[PDB]
């Protein structure tokens, strides 16, 4: 059967696009991770690198 997406209907029947996010933790290839905290550069003094 088919959805009805006519503009005459209010909240509850109008289309709400949804995307499902689910991860896997059975195999361990150590891939897919996000970057963070890429700061500036410091020279000619003490450095906590």
């Amino acid at each position, epitope marked *: *059967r088919s959805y*009805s997406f006519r503009p*005459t*209907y*209010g909240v*509850g029947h109008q289309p709400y696009r949804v995307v499902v996010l689910s991860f896997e933790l059975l195999h361990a290839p150590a891939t897919v991770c996000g970057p963070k905290k890429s700061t500036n550069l410091v020279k000619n003094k003490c450095v906590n690198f």
Partner: antibody
Amino acid sequence: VQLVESGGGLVQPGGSLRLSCAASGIIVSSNYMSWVRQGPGKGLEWVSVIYSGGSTYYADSVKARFTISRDNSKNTLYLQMNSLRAEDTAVYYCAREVVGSNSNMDVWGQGTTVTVSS
Amino acid sequence: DIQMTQSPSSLSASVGDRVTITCQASQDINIYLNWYQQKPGKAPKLLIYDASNLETGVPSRFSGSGSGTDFTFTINSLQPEDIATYYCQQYDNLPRTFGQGTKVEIK
């Protein structure tokens, strides 16, 4: 395609049995069924719905009472209650889905208007 | 719980007259709002599907329009064989509930 009724008589409060309604060849396991109350002094009242996936949805005021059973070959749906509080002066009509999108398969059935009293 | 209320309940004096009966609801609902035509002593019956269709065998004078939680129906023909009662129900929403009841009768 018609419906077969099993019921009648008078029962006391606190007693429950298997209310039974059958089809005339319609699929009973792989179909949608609904139960409603027809009672004197009031309109029709929604009771329960059972889907082909084995999921039952019914009212929260009658929770922990309804136990439904769909027989595979006898084609006769059973329903069992528990702890009747004497408000069942009515009849349980069994029915199908009225319309999914566009369908005229709308055969219904009748029953005996049973009462529960001292 | 969904509560449906209707003003045209008992049209006992509406004999041979234009009928403008209707059903509403508290929460706004779509076209999925059907009706029950219950004869005395027999199960409720469907004439209109999705508040906009017609049963296969019925007189063609029946026409019901439902949009924006307002289902309006008319019966211009006052046939004696349809002494019954009319009910309003909404579906495709949890939970399915029935109306309080309306009376139709020809003197």
